[PDB]
């Protein structure tokens, strides 16, 4: 029948997760953001929709820093993006505490990847309404 | 409840007209054995604060990790992390003072005596002490452990009270600190000749000096001393 899109962790007859696909629609509606990898670094850029003249310029910062070498930018639900960065900061601090060295970027990428994937496994949690562009410079 | 294993001796400090001076030797004592000689016990936090830690070295390295995490945490979602909302010496101290008291109340203390030296954003001199018990106090001159008995009497000759601070220059203050380090090398059995010195000024900023040595020592009079009472040769 139907109703496969009402609950999170439910597979549809064609092996799709509709609640995740609906979370993508929230991202597509959001503000555009980009990332460019250069010869020795990365550059992040984001649009900032000025709703009215009442918004104080250069104050509502969207780009966030994880540790001291990673920068994160996201599109869609801003509160969801902040929650993901909050988790990432804890995850980076957990890595540095045990291994001394600052967290590698591919290492940090999996840590957020596993955390977001976890929110697709249960019907008690909602998928993240954000697509996050992030990166930095490490050992290699 | 624990016991100190690898230890660092005195941390000496005083405040002058424009800022503060703090010093500590590079020794890591293993009981009576002077085991480690390349141990920095003065930790710079930002460009306006230097933390001088004495006592347990493993606990010192833990506090060292906490301060580096504090800088990282302060920079999060903060566009003025290098300006107005930068870490003040008073913020750094109060955090450590809270930790030291919470640890002693749980009967698992950080076996350290800490002096936080720095200059506030308004130009005020900051110099405060905190130990393993969480006991906190401020004075024109501050010294931990062995220096509290020997260096303090020497540094208080320069600055006895609050009114003596604006009268004291960097040259006179540093000379008193360097002299005290020599006296500590004379009489403290757990002291090293090699030491570090840090000057935080409201004008010239932070000046970290490494690999300093105790010079101009008096040992010549030893040749005239023979026996312990009646021996002549």
Curated annotation (Swiss-Prot), chain A:
<comment type="function">
    <text>The proteasome degrades poly-ubiquitinated proteins in the cytoplasm and in the nucleus. It is essential for the regulated turnover of proteins and for the removal of misfolded proteins. The proteasome is a multicatalytic proteinase complex that is characterized by its ability to cleave peptides with Arg, Phe, Tyr, Leu, and Glu adjacent to the leaving group at neutral or slightly basic pH. It has an ATP-dependent proteolytic activity.</text>
</comment>
<comment type="similarity">
    <text>Belongs to the peptidase T1A family.</text>
</comment>
<comment type="subunit">
    <text>The 26S proteasome consists of a 20S proteasome core and two 19S regulatory subunits. The 20S proteasome core is composed of 28 subunits that are arranged in four stacked rings, resulting in a barrel-shaped structure. The two end rings are each formed by seven alpha subunits, and the two central rings are each formed by seven beta subunits. The catalytic chamber with the active sites is on the inside of the barrel.</text>
</comment>
<protein>
    <recommendedName>
        <fullName>Probable proteasome subunit alpha type-7</fullName>
    </recommendedName>
</protein>
Swiss-Prot record, chain B:
<comment type="subunit">
    <text>The 26S proteasome consists of a 20S proteasome core and two 19S regulatory subunits. The 20S proteasome core is composed of 28 subunits that are arranged in four stacked rings, resulting in a barrel-shaped structure. The two end rings are each formed by seven alpha subunits, and the two central rings are each formed by seven beta subunits. The catalytic chamber with the active sites is on the inside of the barrel. Interacts with CIC1.</text>
</comment>
<dbReference type="Pfam" id="PF00227">
    <property type="entry name" value="Proteasome"/>
</dbReference>
<dbReference type="GO" id="GO:0019774">
    <property type="term" value="C:proteasome core complex, beta-subunit complex"/>
</dbReference>
<comment type="function">
    <text>Non-catalytic component of the proteasome which degrades poly-ubiquitinated proteins in the cytoplasm and in the nucleus. It is essential for the regulated turnover of proteins and for the removal of misfolded proteins. The proteasome is a multicatalytic proteinase complex that is characterized by its ability to cleave peptides with Arg, Phe, Tyr, Leu, and Glu adjacent to the leaving group at neutral or slightly basic pH. It has an ATP-dependent proteolytic activity. PRE3 and PRE4 are necessary for the peptidyl-glutamyl-peptide-hydrolyzing activity.</text>
</comment>
<dbReference type="GO" id="GO:0005829">
    <property type="term" value="C:cytosol"/>
</dbReference>
<dbReference type="GO" id="GO:0010499">
    <property type="term" value="P:proteasomal ubiquitin-independent protein catabolic process"/>
</dbReference>
<dbReference type="InterPro" id="IPR023333">
    <property type="entry name" value="Proteasome_suB-type"/>
</dbReference>
<protein>
    <recommendedName>
        <fullName>Proteasome subunit beta type-7</fullName>
    </recommendedName>
</protein>
<dbReference type="GO" id="GO:0034515">
    <property type="term" value="C:proteasome storage granule"/>
</dbReference>
<comment type="similarity">
    <text>Belongs to the peptidase T1B family.</text>
</comment>
<dbReference type="GO" id="GO:0005634">
    <property type="term" value="C:nucleus"/>
</dbReference>
<keyword id="KW-0647">Proteasome</keyword>
<dbReference type="InterPro" id="IPR016295">
    <property type="entry name" value="Proteasome_beta4"/>
</dbReference>
<dbReference type="InterPro" id="IPR016050">
    <property type="entry name" value="Proteasome_bsu_CS"/>
</dbReference>
<dbReference type="GO" id="GO:0043248">
    <property type="term" value="P:proteasome assembly"/>
</dbReference>
<dbReference type="GO" id="GO:0043161">
    <property type="term" value="P:proteasome-mediated ubiquitin-dependent protein catabolic process"/>
</dbReference>
<dbReference type="InterPro" id="IPR029055">
    <property type="entry name" value="Ntn_hydrolases_N"/>
</dbReference>
<keyword id="KW-0963">Cytoplasm</keyword>
<keyword id="KW-0539">Nucleus</keyword>
<dbReference type="GO" id="GO:0000502">
    <property type="term" value="C:proteasome complex"/>
</dbReference>
<dbReference type="InterPro" id="IPR001353">
    <property type="entry name" value="Proteasome_sua/b"/>
</dbReference>
